Amino acid sequence: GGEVPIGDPKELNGMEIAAVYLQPIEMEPRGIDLAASLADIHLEADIHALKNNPNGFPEGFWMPYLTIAYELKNTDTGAIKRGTLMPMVADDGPHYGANIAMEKDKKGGFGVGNYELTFYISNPEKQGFGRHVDEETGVGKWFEPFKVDYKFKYTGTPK
Amino acid sequence: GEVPIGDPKELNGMEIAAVYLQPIEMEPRGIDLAASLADIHLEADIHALKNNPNGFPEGFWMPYLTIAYELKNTDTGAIKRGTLMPMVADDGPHYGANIAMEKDKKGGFGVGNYELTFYISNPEKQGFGRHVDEETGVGKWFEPFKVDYKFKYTGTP
Ligand SMILES: [Cu+2]
Ligand SMILES: [Cu+2]
Ligand SMILES: [Mn+2]
Ligand SMILES: [Mn+2]
């Protein structure tokens, strides 16, 4: 298979925020996510620090401990589903991802067609990640929760 | 203004070094020991080596680790334990804790010779996953391990 890019990457809040999908991915530990066999894609959010990141992250670093909720909407059929992307690592580094049933999902019309994808992104403090705030070593305040929107054509499992 | 603690160790795809500095102020509040009660901020600096076996790019910070510490004054025999928590400073993410040394109510943690031990477990403990497919998959995580350092604590900076 391979990666299919979703929309255009956004630069916001000190971060580059890109979306891609792949074929379904076998994940460990088991039960952590939807089984590959029961899915049609693996959806990934690629989020890294820009230059001059205001929260202390070096350019290029992965942004860890983010809470990323998603909404995937087939605008042709109206079908909507939601979930969360979980942190994980592949051979090219860490990302946030989830296996998702598309055609396999008979509870809605999640077939090939036109989609809107939304990420709802909350800062690392929501998961207990800390920041220095002293004059000598501190960094700027975190972003408030925000959303990014992409549009793409889902053409089926990459093969 | 960081004070090196012992010698860095390279293992399980990671460079693991320790440093201390002056106490820092962390948000959210009520978790890390307040700056004014502490004498040092202890940090573990943990980054991927080349060809990291779990797919982390060389130099990336190693996230989602569980890290406990033990600090022993070998002169007085005082021992304390705690946790190092993930956080970010102007020099990037690390695992750290404010620690009372001279200011520890129990005494025994002043200037002297110390042994520091980190007890580290892998990210799966915190729900972090890994691809295991043929094309993009990566190997198993290390089992829980410890690393040990010796240093002289010369006083609160
Ligand atoms: Cu993934
Ligand atoms: Cu710190
Ligand atoms: Mn990715
Ligand atoms: Mn440091």
What does this entry look like structurally?
- The structure is a homodimer.
- With 159 residues, the first copy, chain A, is mostly beta strands.
- Chain A has a single domain, classed as Periplasmic metal-binding protein Tp34-type (Immunoglobulin-like).
- Chain A contains no helices and ten strands.
- The first copy, chain A, has strands spanning 4-12, 15-22, 27-28, 41-49, 67-74, 80-90, 93-100, 113-122, 130-132, 146-154.
- An eight-stranded antiparallel beta sheet of chain A has the order 1-2-4-7-6-5-8-10, with no helix packed on it.
- Chain A is elongated, with a radius of gyration of 17 Å.
- Chain A starts with a strand and ends in a 5-residue tail after the last strand.
- The structure holds copper (II) ion (CU) (2 copies) and manganese (II) ion (2 copies).
- One copper (II) ion (CU) is lined by residues 24, 41, 43, 87, 89, 94, 96 of chain B.
- One copper (II) ion binds next to strand 4, strand 6 and strand 7 of chain A.
